[PDB]
Amino acid sequence: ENLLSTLNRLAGKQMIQVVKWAKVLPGFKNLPLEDQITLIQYSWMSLSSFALSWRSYKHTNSQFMYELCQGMHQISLQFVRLQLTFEEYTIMKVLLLLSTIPKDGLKSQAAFEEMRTNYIKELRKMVTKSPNGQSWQRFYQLTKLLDSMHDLVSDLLEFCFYTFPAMLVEIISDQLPKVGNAKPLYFHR
Amino acid sequence: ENLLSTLNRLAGKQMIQVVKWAKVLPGFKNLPLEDQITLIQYSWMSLSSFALSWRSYKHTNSQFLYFAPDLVMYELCQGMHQISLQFVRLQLTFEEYTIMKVLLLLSTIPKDGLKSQAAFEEMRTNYIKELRKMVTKSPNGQSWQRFYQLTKLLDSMHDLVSDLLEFCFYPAMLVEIISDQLPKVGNAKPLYFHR
Ligand SMILES: Cc1c(C(=O)Nc2ccc(S(C)(=O)=O)cc2)cn(CCO)c1-c1ccccc1C(F)(F)F
Ligand SMILES: Cc1c(C(=O)Nc2ccc(S(C)(=O)=O)cc2)cn(CCO)c1-c1ccccc1C(F)(F)F
């Protein structure tokens, strides 16, 4: 009984710490607030898998739902193969945040597409400086890894839409709403 | 101890029922979501005063401030009771209430301006026009007169609550119901670098 509760409570501790991180990313809180929410929601499983596999690779050197956990452990091993930088994690994290959208599209697809492109360019630039042994190779791998991140979580998004709150919506809109200062509008001066 | 708790809990019951009402108003949920929130926030005391004074005039014919059927500070309540009496003077229609309510919702903004001042200014204008049209059909006893009164009444509604906005300032509930229908949660399209 106790196990599945704690992971849904750690999931919650982090989902609030993701918001705080995303809200410094350039041009995020400059998106529509509808979209901020949608983009964090849709990404979350891609985002978590990466983050978990990362802390595997960093903390216990890729040592520590076994159908489903096996994937993450497998990626954390890939991280050692690539000797992934932090830079490459934080960028690839952002990219995952922007890799899952609704088929409908977002409020401002135009704004979103610039942001994603902006970041995809950061990666491009960032691997004409940290490859191994040319740049184009490093790019092919980091990209294909981000893709396989979707495949890992491919069939487990419906199975989340169950577990998928009033918590985060508080912290996202928190800083953006702009609450003495009030200007009332009169019909006669 | 018990009194001031219940009014802050009736305030909360209504704050959620305002959201649901606003979200059918034409061109509201078409505003920025930042603005929906700001507009409901800033208006709330203008909005409540009108609504309370209205249920006075409708339910008990302007005798007691009918806070609810579950309930049939006097510096401040005196104002509302005073307005509810004005309502009888004008024999205010429901139409005139619901429109004037919307106008109050769009009558208080931050001096900074909203995310989409342009969008907001069209909305307000749109509704100010509804009034204008709506009192070239329900006056008494010419149209221009009825406008002067309903407008000056919406103004006095700001004066009534003039100094009590700080005292309100100085939640996670409504933010849930506003964004509720607007965010658009199987359907997911993941974006691949290689097909
Ligand atoms: C533990 C967990 C987490 C989690 O911790 N995620 C996380 C995301 C980002 C970061 S970051 C970028 O480094 O801040 C850190 C952590 C998300 N979920 C899914 C909940 O809907 C679960 C969960 C719940 C129930 C069963 C199974 C699992 C699990 F996903 F673990 F398999
Ligand atoms: C009761 C109340 C209400 C209230 O019920 N408002 C309301 C708004 C719209 C509608 S509608 C359009 O018809 O749905 C109905 C009702 C708002 N506040 C202010 C709270 O910040 C209080 C309150 C709390 C504490 C002390 C004093 C008061 C009071 F305002 F009453 F003086």
Give the number of other Cβ atoms within 10 Å of residue A83's Cβ: 9
CB pair distance less than 8 Å for B179 and A42: no
User: Helices B33-59 and B143-160 meet at what angle, rounded to 10?
Assistant: 110
Q: How is residue B120 written in tokens? A: 């907001």
Give the number of other Cβ atoms within 10 Å of residue A134's Cβ: 10
Residues in chain B, total = 195
Which residues 6+ apart lie within 8 Å of B70 measured at CB? B10
Rounded CA gap, B162 and B158, in Å? 6
Q: Are A84 and A61 in contact (CB under 8 A)?
A: no
Q: Are B159 and A112 in contact (CB under 8 A)?
A: no
C-alpha triplet B111, B113, B117: angle, nearest 5°: 145
Q: Check if B11 has its Cβ closer than 6 Å to any atom of ligand 2.
A: yes
Q: Are B108 and B162 in contact (CB under 8 A)?
A: no
Q: How is residue A136 written in tokens? A: 């184009």
Q: Which residues pair with B68 in a beta bridge?
A: B71
Q: Whose atoms come closest to the Cα of B65: which ligand?
A: 2
Closest CA to A75 of A110, A47, A108, A103: A47
Which residues 6+ apart lie within 8 Å of A188 measured at CB? B151, B152, B155
Closest CA to B106 of B66, B60, B158: B158
Q: Are B13 and B80 in contact (CB under 8 A)?
A: no
Which residues 6+ apart lie within 8 Å of B159 measured at CB? none
How many C-alpha atoms does B16 have within 13 Å on its Cβ side? Answer: 12
Rounded CA gap, A7 and B52, in Å? 47
Q: How is residue B146 written in tokens? A: 């009825």
Distance from CA of B177 to the nearest CA of A (A): 10
Chain centroid to CA A159? 19
Q: Where are the alpha helices (DSSP H) in B60-171?
A: 74-90, 94-105, 117-134, 143-160, 166-169
* C-alpha B33 to ligand 2 mean position (Å): 23
Rounded CA gap, B32 and B48, in Å? 23
State residue B96 phi and psi, 5-degree precision: -60, -35
CB pair distance less than 8 Å for B189 and A103: yes
CB pair distance less than 8 Å for A169 and B176: yes
